[PDB]
């Protein structure tokens, strides 16, 4: 599940989490978004909702980075950022 | 566990 989202002047807009001791969710080192900002890029966009992970941002996969990593992708936005969030299954 | 906002 990609997303074309426009950077800006405010921001994002939302939060985040990620990454071995500082993980959103058991068994998933992916990055979670844990809570998102009114009339935020996410919020506005409608997309993206509390729950779903971190597939890859910019060419770079969120799913197997620290915390620092999943803040420093979400950061890392220019003119524009190239979402991709993974969807959740798992075979147990 | 740690949740920053971006």
Redesign the interface.
């Given at each position: 599940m990609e997303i074309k989202l426009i950077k800006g002047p405010k921001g994002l807009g939302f939060s985040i989490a990620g990454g071995v001791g500082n993980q959103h969710i058991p068994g998933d080192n992916s990055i979670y978004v844990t809570k998102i900002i009114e009339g935020g890029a996410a919020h506005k966009d409608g997309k993206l909702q509390i729950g779903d992970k971190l597939l890859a941002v910019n060419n770079v996969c969120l799913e197997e980075v620290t915390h620092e990593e999943a803040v420093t992708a979400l950061k890392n936005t220019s003119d524009f950022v190239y979402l991709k969030v993974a969807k959740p299954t798992g075979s147990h | 566990?740690?949740?920053?906002?971006?």
């Open positions: - | 566990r740690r949740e920053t906002q971006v």
